[PDB]
Amino acid sequence: MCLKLNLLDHVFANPFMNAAGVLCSTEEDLRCMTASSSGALVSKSCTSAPRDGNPEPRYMAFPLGSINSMGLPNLGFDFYLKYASDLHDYSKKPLFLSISGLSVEENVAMVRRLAPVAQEKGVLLELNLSCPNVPGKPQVAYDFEAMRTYLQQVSLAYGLPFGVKMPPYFDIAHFDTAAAVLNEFPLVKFVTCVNSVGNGLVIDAESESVVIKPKQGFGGLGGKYILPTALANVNAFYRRCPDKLVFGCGGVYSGEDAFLHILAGASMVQVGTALQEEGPGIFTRLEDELLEIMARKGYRTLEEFRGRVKTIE
Amino acid sequence: MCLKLNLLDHVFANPFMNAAGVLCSTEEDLRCMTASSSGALVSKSCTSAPRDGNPEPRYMAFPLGSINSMGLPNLGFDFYLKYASDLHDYSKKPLFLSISGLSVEENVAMVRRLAPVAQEKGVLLELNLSCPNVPGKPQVAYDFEAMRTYLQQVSLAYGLPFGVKMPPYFDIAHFDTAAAVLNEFPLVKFVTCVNSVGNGLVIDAESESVVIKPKQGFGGLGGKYILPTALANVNAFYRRCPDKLVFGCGGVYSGEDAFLHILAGASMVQVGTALQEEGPGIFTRLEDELLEIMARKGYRTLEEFRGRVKTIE
Ligand SMILES: Cc1cc2nc3c(=O)[nH]c(=O)nc-3n(C[C@H](O)[C@H](O)[C@H](O)COP(=O)(O)O)c2cc1C
Numbered sequence: 239m240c241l242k243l244n245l246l247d248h249v250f251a252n253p254f255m256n257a258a259g260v261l262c263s264t265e266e267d268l269r270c271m272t273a274s275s276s277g278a279l280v281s282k283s284c285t286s287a288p289r290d291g292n293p294e295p296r297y298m299a300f301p302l303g304s305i306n307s308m309g310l311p312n313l314g315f316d317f318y319l320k321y322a323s324d325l326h327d328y329s330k331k332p333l334f335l336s337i338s339g340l341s342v343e344e345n346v347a348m349v350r351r352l353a354p355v356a357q358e359k360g361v362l363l364e365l366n367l368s369c370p371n372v373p374g375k376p377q378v379a380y381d382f383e384a385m386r387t388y389l390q391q392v393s394l395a396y397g398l399p400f401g402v403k404m405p406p407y408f409d410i411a412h413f414d415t416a417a418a419v420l421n422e423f424p425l426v427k428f429v430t431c432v433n434s435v436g437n438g439l440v441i442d443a444e445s446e447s448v449v450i451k452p453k454q455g456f457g458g459l460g461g462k463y464i465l466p467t468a469l470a471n472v473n474a475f476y477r478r479c480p481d482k483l484v485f486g487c488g489g490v491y492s493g494e495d496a497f498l499h500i501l502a503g504a505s506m507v508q509v510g511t512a513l514q515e516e517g518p519g520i521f522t523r524l525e526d527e528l529l530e531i532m533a534r535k536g537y538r539t540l541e542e543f544r545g546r547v548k549t550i551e
Numbered sequence: 552m553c554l555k556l557n558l559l560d561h562v563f564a565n566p567f568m569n570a571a572g573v574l575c576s577t578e579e580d581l582r583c584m585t586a587s588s589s590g591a592l593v594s595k596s597c598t599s600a601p602r603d604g605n606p607e608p609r610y611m612a613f614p615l616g617s618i619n620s621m622g623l624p625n626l627g628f629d630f631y632l633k634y635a636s637d638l639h640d641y642s643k644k645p646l647f648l649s650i651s652g653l654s655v656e657e658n659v660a661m662v663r664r665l666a667p668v669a670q671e672k673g674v675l676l677e678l679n680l681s682c683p684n685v686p687g688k689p690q691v692a693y694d695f696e697a698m699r700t701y702l703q704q705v706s707l708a709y710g711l712p713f714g715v716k717m718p719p720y721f722d723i724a725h726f727d728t729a730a731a732v733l734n735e736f737p738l739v740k741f742v743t744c745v746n747s748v749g750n751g752l753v754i755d756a757e758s759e760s761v762v763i764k765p766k767q768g769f770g771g772l773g774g775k776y777i778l779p780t781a782l783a784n785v786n787a788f789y790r791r792c793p794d795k796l797v798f799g800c801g802g803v804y805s806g807e808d809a810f811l812h813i814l815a816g817a818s819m820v821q822v823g824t825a826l827q828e829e830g831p832g833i834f835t836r837l838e839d840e841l842l843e844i845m846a847r848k849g850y851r852t853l854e855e856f857r858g859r860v861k862t863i864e
């Protein structure tokens with residue numbers, strides 16, 4: 239039994255990958271994720287020009303998960319493009335490139351230049367509509383008219399299949415509306431649910447202080463805190479977008495957690511906080527553990543249970 | 552060393568109370584909360600007519616918290632009004648009455664009838680703008696125009712100080728807008744943050760099934776999952792509504808959690824999931840544990856640290 243699968247005209251050894259932003263900012267990082275046993279990797283969300291991001295401390299982890307307001311620190315689109323065009327070994331695994339421009343115009347500018355490299359090399363675009371940590375720039379996908387504009391302009395400028403990194407929603411009417419926007423765009427072939435649960439606040443009792451410096455301590459939550467929210471969103475979009483793929487992200491620490499994402503509808507499963515904390519060795523453990531649950535249940539393939547979560551009556 | 556507070560023209564032995572919906576639906580529940588060591592109590596959110604609610608199982612709890620889609624089961628407004636009017640012993644502690652009509656008109660109908668009782672007895676209204684579990688009713692506080700309508704109509708019909716039960720937000724722009732809305736209404740004297748993180752999905756790996764029957768398993772999350780979300784919303788409104796009180800709710804299991812809430816700006820501190828799981832004995836524990844933290848830190852009263860969370864730099 240092997241976990242290999244085919245999606246988006248690519249082959250994957252297993253459904254596991256890093257979550258964007260974790261272990262993927264530098265050439266070193268990307269070579270490390272390439273050398274891991276993950277089935278694919280995704281680059282750090284990038285902007286046209288390099289960014290240092292927010293002041294430190296900007297990430298902190300706890301038994302139940304993490305908080306971050308990194309502020310989109312990255313090496314600049316030129317670097318990530320060059321990685322995709324010249325440095326990545328596509329014979330090892332597929333690559334996704336995350337773009338996170340701060341305006342529609344900035345995203346269009348990047349996608350116009352990524353297009354030829356996607357045609358030549360097969361690198362996959364993940365368009366980030368859900369950064370909750372840049373001051374004065376609220377999450378795009380929480381403004382449905384802004385989300386539609388971004389997806390119109392990118393689709394026209396890019397002209398090739400791509401995916402979108404979605405924020406979590408918490409209301410059935412939101413799920414309905416967000417999915418109907420996505421469904422207006424046939425080039426959106428995958429939807430990654432979810433980005434961090436925005437603007438939580440961790441406080442240290444002893445010091446009486448917030449734990450990250452930017453935004454008065456406010457930052458996106460990841461980890462054990464967000465698994466039920468992540469599952470809800472994966473299933474919501476999997477139910478509402480029957481002609482698109484859903485990639486699960488949020489709260490994955492174990493094979494058992496990945497099993498639930500896949501039951502909810504996930505095709506790929508992305509690992510953020512747990513990867514940041516454990517390191518790339520987590521991928522061999524996740525694979526071993528998912529295989530073991532599958533064996534105990536008699537499943538031979540992922541397709542046998544993907545999206546097959548049961549409801550009561 | 553002292554847990555006493557005085558606000559809204561009432562005196563409280565301590566800041567703890569039940570979160571609406573937990574241990575407060577029947578006369579029995581209400582007498583039990585009255586006999587406990589809580590500083591106050593709040594009744595089940597009510598509608599004009601009695602309601603059975605959703606099918607069972609509709610609540611489930613786990614180590615990291617709870618999921619519920621109760622469906623607003625309640626004995627009806629006439630019962631909670633009579634409770635406030637004839638049955639509650641106000642010499643024991645103050646009473647809040649939660650109202651959660653399904654339209655502005657239902658709300659107005661109720662508050663017109665509550666007013667003379669609030670005047671005579673000193674019962675305090677908590678208006679629920681955040682139920683996430685009645686199908687086809689996306690929560691009022693997520694539609695800022697609807698929210699404004701509700702508050703205008705209720706202010707005009709009720710004409711007395713009241714408070715509001717708010718959903719969590721996850722976007723700084725939403726904090727800004729919601730608080731600005733609330734700031735329009737001078738009769739809104741307190742803001743309870745937060746209701747359950749809406750429409751999460753708990754899935755049992757062994758049975759491959761969702762764990763609650765209603766809404767295909769989608770329900771509101773409470774407990775450990777939500778503490779940093781709750782602290783963020785408490786602080787966001789504390790900072791934005793300097794002329795109002797903020798009551799904290801979400802993730803309180805310990806005196807330490809309560810301390811964090813209070814640091815974040817909370818006046819009263821409500822206990823939902825942990826109270827449902829542990830029972831009303833929790834209140835003596837939370838009091839002892841909060842007093843222990845205060846003593847270690849040299850704090851003699853709540854106002855010495857309320858709202859004094861430190862930020863970095
Ligand atoms: C340090 C850090 C940086 C991240 N950077 C990005 C990013 O650049 N782009 C993005 O789409 N999401 C980013 N995220 C969000 C993760 O991709 C992911 O959606 C979120 O952390 C939830 O998954 P988890 O529960 O496995 O952490 C970041 C998360 C962390 C903790």
Ligand SMILES: Cc1cc2nc3c(=O)[nH]c(=O)nc-3n(C[C@H](O)[C@H](O)[C@H](O)COP(=O)(O)O)c2cc1C
Pocket residue numbers: 570571572573595596610617618619621623649679716745746747772773774775777800801802803821822823824825827
């Ligand atoms: C079984 C149950 C019933 C609830 N009913 C109500 C209610 O009637 N009205 C309301 O405003 N919130 C209701 N809530 C939400 C709680 O008041 C509270 O906002 C939420 O559970 C988060 O607090 P916690 O983390 O302490 O559970 C209910 C929660 C549960 C678990």
Ligand SMILES: O=C(O)c1[nH]c(=O)[nH]c(=O)c1Br
Pocket residue numbers: 259283306307308309310311338366368369370371433434458
């Ligand atoms: O602050 C980050 O860089 C970051 N952090 C997140 O949690 N999600 C994102 O999309 C981004 Br771009």
Ligand SMILES: O=C(O)c1[nH]c(=O)[nH]c(=O)c1Br
Pocket residue numbers: 572596619620621622623624651679681682683684746747771
């Ligand atoms: O389903 C409920 O009764 C319920 N459950 C919640 O979590 N919050 C509410 O406001 C309500 Br009214």
